[PDB]
Amino acid sequence: TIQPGTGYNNGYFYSYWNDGHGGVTYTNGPGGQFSVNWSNSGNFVGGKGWQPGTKNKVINFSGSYNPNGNSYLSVYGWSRNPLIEYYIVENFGTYNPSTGATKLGEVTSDGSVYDIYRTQRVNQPSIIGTATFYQYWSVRRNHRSSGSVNTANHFNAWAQQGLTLGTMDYQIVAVEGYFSSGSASITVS
Numbered sequence: 001t002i003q004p005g006t007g008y009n010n011g012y013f014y015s016y017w018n019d020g021h022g023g024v025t026y027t028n029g030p031g032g033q034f035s036v037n038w039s040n041s042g043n044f045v046g047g048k049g050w051q052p053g054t055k056n057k058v059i060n061f062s063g064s065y066n067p068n069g070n071s072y073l074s075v076y077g078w079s080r081n082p083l084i085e086y087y088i089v090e091n092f093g094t095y096n097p098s099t100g101a102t103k104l105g106e107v108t109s110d111g112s113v114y115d116i117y118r119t120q121r122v123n124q125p126s127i128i129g130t131a132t133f134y135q136y137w138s139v140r141r142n143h144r145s146s147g148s149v150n151t152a153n154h155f156n157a158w159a160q161q162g163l164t165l166g167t168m169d170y171q172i173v174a175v176e177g178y179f180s181s182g183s184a185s186i187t188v189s
């Protein structure tokens with residue numbers, strides 16, 4: 001298991017963050033593989049990918065994803081200037097992260113329609129410190145734990161709708177939890 005932070009493992013960038021509550025272990029495996037095991041966690045996000053990401057990467061993911069409670073499985077990353085936290089959500093647990101959010105469009109990609117949303121975080125942790133920032137979401141209608149994500153289809157649809165991204169920071173396939181339990185084993189490429 002590893003220490004919250006960022007770095008490289010077997011050629012892949014990783015990021016593992018948590019709120020300090022406990023109840024979650026993150027492990028880096030061979031190649032693009034990582035695993036998460038959590039029991040009565042707080043808020044955490046971990047996974048493997050790239051630093052920096054790109055606006056036209058085709059990302060593959062494969063494995064198992066077994067949340068018990070509030071959790072997401074997504075292509076996840078940030079842009080700077082403007083600061084944006086973004087998600088291409090392929091699966092989730094008890095909570096659709098777009099609940100109560102205003103729908104800003106649809107995009108069809110990689111075998112499913114996705115619904116597009118913008119939300120806002122206020123005085124929340126980020127890659128540059130505590131801040132207020134927008135989040136962009138593509139939420140897949142057909143849930144899955146393996147597949148291919150053509151990120152350009154999402155970024156282009158977001159930009160079309162006025163959801164523009166700045167300079168890309170990291171870009172990973174992430175398991176996120178918010179006060180839940182679960183297990184996951186995911187291989188990225």
Ligand SMILES: O[C@@H]1[C@@H](O)[C@H](O[C@@H]2CO[C@@H](O[C@@H]3CO[C@@H](O)[C@H](O)[C@H]3O)[C@H](O)[C@H]2O)OC[C@H]1O
Nearest residue numbers: 015017043044045085121124125126127128129
């Ligand atoms: O040391 C700093 C790290 O702690 C910092 O990490 C980022 C902190 O914010 C995390 O984003 C949250 C993830 O969960 C979502 O539900 C919330 O909306 C976000 O606030 C992000 O994942 C971490 O990378 O990065 C900068 C370091 O100095």
